[PDB]
From Swiss-Prot:
Changing S94A: Weakens interaction with D53 and attenuates strigolactone-induced degradation of D53. One of its GO terms (cellular component) is cytoplasm. One of its GO terms (biological process) is strigolactone biosynthetic process. The chain holds residues 54 to 318 of 318 of the full protein. Involved in strigolactone (SL) signaling pathway. May function downstream of SL synthesis, as a component of hormone signaling or as an enzyme that participates in the conversion of SL to the bioactive form. Strigolactones are hormones that inhibit tillering and shoot branching through the MAX-dependent pathway, contribute to the regulation of shoot architectural response to phosphate-limiting conditions and function as rhizosphere signal that stimulates hyphal branching of arbuscular mycorrhizal fungi and trigger seed germination of root parasitic weeds. Substrate binds at S94, C188, H244. It is found in: Cytoplasm; Nucleus. This is Strigolactone esterase D14.
Length: 265
């Protein structure tokens, strides 16, 4: 109930087929603004901000509570239960792809389909697993985020967007600079300590994994890993564009995949 106000919950469009759009790190629900008009004629669309978004009062961020992703899953489930939604499709980017996987395992009745963008079960490398990051490398990232958050964010934004799309770099920067620096570091630390590999087989919902030509945080092999180990009927949909945030940089192309993936579920 009060969660609906705190996390800026919005329900737009209409229809029997309900879709939840859940943003990732460094953005808020506004990141969906360009894809939204492609969905609202045929779907009731639920949007909300993660508690870590700069568009949420940062004094709600309880570092103790949000020490793991299950706490974010709790917020998502509380929202959907408050809205009395019994069944939906879920589209998650980045940390929200992880939240969606966990949420679908907790509540398989509620999640009829997952669409995962910029998705990984584990970012750190392991003995027989390529996540894309080494321990020493993330240590340096965390240091930079603390030592000079502004400089870190300035360098990260174009790398994340990937494609040379100035408007998208500006827009991602806008929200990245809006994140409280301590919250931003904490969320990054939480993501980097999360390893979902063991639980992927527990996902029952069909899944579409969206893969771009290159993603600075998600090696190509990860999409293949997700397809091999997610427990539901999983396909990989390739977008002919570069970057981690195709909803910002290639919304038309992404909208094609969303319209097709959300046609029946």
């Amino acid at each position: 109930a009060k969660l609906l106000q705190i996390l800026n919950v919005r329900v737009v469009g209409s229809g029997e087929r309900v879709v939840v759009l859940s943003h990732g790190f460094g953005t808020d629900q506004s990141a969906w603004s360009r894809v939204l008009p492609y969905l609202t004629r045929d779907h009731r669309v639920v949007l909300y901000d993660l508690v870590c978004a700069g568009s949420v009062n940062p004094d709600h961020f309880d570092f103790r509570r949000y020490d793991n992703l299950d706490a974010y899953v709790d917020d998502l489930l509380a929202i959907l239960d408050a809205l009395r939604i019994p069944r939906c499709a879920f589209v998650g980017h980045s940390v929200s792809a992880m939240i969606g996987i966990l949420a679908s395992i907790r509540r398989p009745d509620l999640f009829a389909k997952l669409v995962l963008i910029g998705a990984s079960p584990r970012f750190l490398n392991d003995s027989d697993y390529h996540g894309g990051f080494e321990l020493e490398e993330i240590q340096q990232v965390f240091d930079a985020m603390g030592a000079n958050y502004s400089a870190w964010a300035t360098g990260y934004a174009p790398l994340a967007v990937g494609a040379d799309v100035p408007a998208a770099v500006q827009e991602f920067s806008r929200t990245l600079f809006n994140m409280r620096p301590d919250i931003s570091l904490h969320v990054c630390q939480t993501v980097f300590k999360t390893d979902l590999r063991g639980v992927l087989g527990m996902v029952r919902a069909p899944c579409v994994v969206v893969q771009t030509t290159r993603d600075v945080s998600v090696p190509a092999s990860v999409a293949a890993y997700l397809k091999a180990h997610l427990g539901g009927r999983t396909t990989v949909e390739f977008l002919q564009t570069e970057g981690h945030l195709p909803h910002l940089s290639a919304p038309s192309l992404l909208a094609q995949v969303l319209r097709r993936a959300l046609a029946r579920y």
